[PDB]
Curated annotation (Swiss-Prot):
Protein name: Palmitoleoyl-protein carboxylesterase NOTUM
Organism encoding this protein: Homo sapiens (Human)
Tissue note: Rarely expressed in adult normal tissues.
Location(s), subcellular: Secreted
Conditions for induction: Up-regulated in hepatocellular carcinoma (HCC) with high intracellular beta-catenin.
Coiled-coil region: none
Length: 342
């Protein structure tokens, strides 16, 4: 069980102005800290944010949050469930800003909602330093789906935050799960992200912003474009046939030639974008998210599980014989890997 703490700085808020927060389980024999960013789509104007407030309110407000959460997958403290980091300090950061973790805008007489995802992450880091993060050796910022994209947008900001606060010895790294999307042509017929950034006052990493320049910051929400601009080490986990990617592409699974070619090309394109990503795990499965699922230990690429790959990554940041870090399936159809989940 991780225990809830609402932010002491109550001006850093969820969408509706309630305080943001984090769930924490300390492990005082460990200098490793895992901060996990929850996912869950987004909203990009008054009308669809109003709809989200009616039926997804826990993603917009802390007023109904429970006082505890069970840690699962990479957040589990049991070695059998989490071979990688079972003895780490565990933090789960709820997603209540609806902005892919990019926003820096307060509620006001001009704004019905607050979009403060980027500031929530910084305030969580600040308050954790007084609860033991100051003695850390590694801070791993992880996240799934919208939280995986949030890792890409914020990992270098966390690294700069700790440097300027006077903690240059804490090594900041990122783990982005199911947040690596392609801005491809649909099977049947990015503007929402463009509108969202203006609505949220969204922020992107500075080097990426300077490449694409004003009006074009939406480009930095796509992993293959923002990743080359990042300085912190980042491990990328992405199913080659991600279900959220197929949903936005208007694909719903008797497959005929046109759809067969479309699906095969999508996998080839995703594999291509990961060619120069040295720390990555990309199986040929139809699925979405993995790292906080209890059976995340089950899938393998070329005989290597994801917990092993992450361990090999740790060793590489001190090629390794028998301990690979770049694991991308070459077979071209969903479930051509026998270890895919059912
Ligand atoms: N082809 C394509 C894929 C995803 C999207 S998105 O609106 O959901 N934008 C994003 C971007 C990064 C993370 C999550 N959503 C739009 C178009
Ligand atoms: C609380 O957070 C806000 C937003 O980041 C900031 O302006 C303010 O200085 C913070 N308060 C304190 C006491 O640090």
């Amino acid at each position: 069980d991780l225990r809830l703490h609402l932010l002491l700085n109550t001006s850093v808020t969820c969408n509706d102005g309630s305080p943001a927060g984090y769930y924490l389980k300390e492990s005082r024999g460990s200098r490793r800290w895992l901060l996990f960013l929850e996912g869950g789509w987004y909203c990009f104007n008054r009308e669809n944010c109003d709809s989200r407030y009616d039926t997804m309110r826990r993603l917009m407000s802390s007023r109904d949050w429970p006082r505890t959460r069970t840690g699962t997958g990479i957040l589990s403290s049991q070695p059998e469930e989490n071979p990688y980091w079972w003895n780490a300090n565990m933090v789960f950061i709820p997603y209540c800003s609806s902005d892919v973790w990019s926003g820096a805008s307060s509620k006001s007489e001009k704004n019905e909602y607050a979009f403060m995802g980027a500031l929530i992450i910084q305030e969580v880091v600040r308050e954790l330093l007084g609860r033991g993060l100051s003695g850390a050796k590694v801070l791993l910022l992880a996240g799934s789906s919208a939280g995986g994209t949030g890792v890409l947008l914020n990992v270098d900001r966390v690294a700069e935050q700790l440097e300027k606060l006077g903690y240059p010895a804490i090594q900041v790294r990122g783990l982005a799960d199911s947040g690596w999307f392609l801005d491809n042509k649909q099977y049947r017929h990015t503007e929402a992200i463009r509108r969202g950034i203006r609505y949220w006052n969204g922020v992107v990493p500075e080097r990426c912003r300077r490449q694409f320049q004003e009006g074009e910051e939406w480009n930095c929400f796509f992993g293959y474009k923002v990743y080359p601009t990042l300085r912190s080490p980042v491990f990328v986990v992405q199913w080659l046939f991600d279900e959220a990617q197929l949903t936005v592409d208007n694909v719903h699974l008797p497959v005929q030639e046109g759809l067969r070619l479309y699906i095969q090309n999508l996998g080839r394109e995703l594999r291509h974008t990961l060619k120069d990503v040295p720390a990555s795990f990309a199986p040929a499965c139809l699925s979405h998210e993995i790292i906080i699922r209890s059976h995340w230990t089950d899938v393998q690429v070329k005989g290597t599980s994801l917990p092993r790959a992450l361990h090999c990554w740790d060793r590489s940041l001190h090629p390794l014989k028998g301990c690979p870090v770049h694991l991308v399936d070459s077979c071209p159809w969903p479930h051509c890997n026998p270890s895919c989940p059912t």
